[PDB]
Each structure stands twice: as structure tokens, then as C-alpha cells.
Amino acid sequence: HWGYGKHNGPEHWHKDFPIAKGERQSPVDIDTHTAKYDPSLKPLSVSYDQATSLRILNNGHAFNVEFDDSQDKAVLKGGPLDGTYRLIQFHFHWGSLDGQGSEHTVDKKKYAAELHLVHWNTKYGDFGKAVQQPDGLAVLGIFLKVGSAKPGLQKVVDVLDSIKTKGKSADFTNFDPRGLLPESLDYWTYPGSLTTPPLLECVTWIVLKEPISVSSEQVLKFRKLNFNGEGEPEELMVDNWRPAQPLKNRQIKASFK
Ligand SMILES: Cc1cc(=S)c(O)co1
Ligand SMILES: [Zn+2]
């Protein structure tokens, strides 16, 4: 089945998911010189005060921190979006080394990891129906650079020992995702896709310009997770990123000058 290795990695996905070679795939390189400022964009509105985290799950390709999305508790709106998108989960993609790990790049620069906060458009009723639509999702992407620790990340780092292998989950209530955000909400935006199979083209990407700093020890702990299940040979969960894909007939817009 799909993964990130030589025999089942990004270069193979198109055989089971032909949309891998579609017209709006993600991630992409963000060429900051060619991203035009769009003064009709709005400030983003990130309303996470009432976020209800539930659980953390190692799904065999990342760990997802999941939220109660059965009411408008943690929502994204404004910016490029029409209407209201509800937070369902966040996750990261990261490298085996601090020089790689992000999916988006910025003038070909790779960051050590990238956080994705995944939201679905409430006009579609739930996540499953939203992923059948070209405006079903909004993903807020945030780059991680290695430097000072990110205090708000530490409760995620400290539970990873309990979900080392594929299929393990742990209670993860009362986590506040506001502690993962940088100071500025300046962003780039473009239409794209999920970056994992099934690679569906549902996503308004909103990628923050300001990275967050995380400590080398924090990202080291991500790299101790396993892609395999318990009792299977150990394969460290590293390099779970898809490389930049062709921009095709797309323009990336900037919310800032
Ligand atoms: C739904 C979903 C979204 C992203 S961004 C991902 O990597 C996996 O699954
Ligand atoms: Zn992702």
C-alpha cells in the first residue's frame, strides 16, 4: 500500500491515485517574487478559543491530533474563504534531518517540518461530503524551523511515546492549538490538494509566511515514531513529505506586501 519508501513513495502514488498528476496538486514551491499581493484578500480569522481536542492517533504515516467537529468550536474563516470551515485534525510532516521535511517550499527553501491544520467547509455537513467538493477543505500550513523550543508543542511531544506504532491512539483532551501559531497571520494562498493519497483536489491552501521555531529535541522526538505496527520491524517515521508538484495553471496570492 502507499507510503514514503522507495517502492511505495510519491513517485508511485499515481498508479493507484491518478489525480497525483492532476491540475491542482500540492504541495508547491512558493516563489515569493511571483506571488502577487492581493488587496481584496481578508485577514484570516482563526477562532480556536472553544477548540475541543479529543485524541492523538498514529495512522502509520503521521500522528493526527483530532478535534470534536460536531459543532462550530474551532473555525477558520475570512482570508480567501467564503463561509466557515471547522477544524477536524492537525498533523505534521517532517524530515530525517533538519534541512528537509516541509512539503511546501519558499523560494526552494525546505523547512524542518510543516504543520497542517485541516478544516472542512460546514456547508457540506461533514468531512466525508466536503472531500467530494472542490472547495471542501481549507488547510492552514505553518512551517517549523529548528531553534528555540515551542512551549505549546511540548504536550504533543510528550505523548508520542504512547503512540509509537501504527494504530496506537491516546486520549488527548484539553490541548489548545493556539499555542502552535506564529505571531503574524500574513499568508500565501492557492488552490490545491491533499498531499497524501487520495490526493483529492479539495483544498484552499493558506500557508503562513512566519515559521514557528521548535527545538532540535522536539523534532528529534517526532523522528522516534514508527511507520510500522507493534511487533513488525521498526521503520522510523521520518521523511513523510511529498515534494513540490508542478504549479500548472495556478497563481499564488499574498495577503501582505
Ligand atoms: C486530510 C489530510 C490532509 C492532509 S494535509 C494530509 O497530509 C493528510 O490527510
Ligand atoms: Zn498534511
Q: Are 10 and 4 in contact (CB under 8 A)?
A: yes
Q: Which residues contact 21 (CB under 8 A, 6 or more apart)?
A: 14
Nearest CA to ligand 1 atom 4: 194
Q: Which three cell numbers stand for residue 228?
A: 510500522
List, in sequence order, every residue forming a beta bridge with 170; answer none if it has no partner: 56
Q: Which three cell numbers stand for residue 148?
A: 528555540
Give the residue ranges of the annotated binding site. Answer: 91, 93, 116, 195-196
For ligand 1, whether the C-beta of 139 sits within 6 Å is yes
Q: Which three cell numbers stand for residue 53?
A: 481536542
For ligand 1, whether the C-beta of 218 sits within 6 Å is no
User: What is the 3 state secondary structure string of the chain?
Assistant: CCCCCCCCCCCCHHHCCHHHHCCCCCCCEECCCCCEECCCCCCEEEECCCCCEEEEEECCCCEEEEECCCCCCCEEEECCCCCCEEEEEEEEEECCCCCCCCCCEECCECCCEEEEEEEEEHHHCCHHHHCCCCCCEEEEEEEEEECCCCHHHHHHHHHHHHHCCCCCEEECCCCCHHHHCCCCCCEEEEEECCCCCCCCCCEEEEEECCCEEECHHHHHHHCCCECCCCCCCCCECCCCCCCCCCCCCCCCEECCC
The CATH number assigned to the domain holding 138 equals 3.10.200.10
Report how far apart, in Å, the C-alpha atoms of 110 and of each of 30, 76, 106, 185, 217 are: 11, 26, 7, 20, 19
Q: Give the Å distance between the CA of 198 and the centre of ligand 1.
A: 9
> Backbone phi, then psi, for 217, in 5-degree steps?
-65, -35
Give the experimental resolution in Å. 1.6
- 203-208 and 137-146 strand pairing: parallel
Say how far residue 52 (Cα) sits from the centre of its chain.
Answer: 19
Mutate to test the pocket of ligand 1, among 65, 66, 116, 143 (most ligand atoms within 8 A of CB): 116
Q: Which three cell numbers stand for residue 139?
A: 488547510
Domain residues for the domain of 193 are 1-257
Q: Cα dihedral angle (250, 115, 91, 138), rounded to 10 degrees?
A: -40
For ligand 1, whether the C-beta of 116 sits within 6 Å is yes
- Of 94, 174, 78, 99, whose CA–CA distance to 142 is shortest? 94
Catalytic residues: 61
Q: In this structure, which ligand is nearest to the CA of 205?
A: 1
- Of 20, 103, 101, 226, whose CA–CA distance to 12 is shortest? 20
Taking phi over 0 as left and psi of -120 to 50 as alpha, with beta for the rest, 110 belongs to beta
- Say how far apart CA 137 and CA 122 lie, in whole Å: 10
The number of domains in the chain is 1
Method: X-ray
Residues after which a C–N gap over 2.5 Å breaks the chain: none
List, in sequence order, every residue forming a beta bridge with 205; answer none if it has no partner: 139, 190
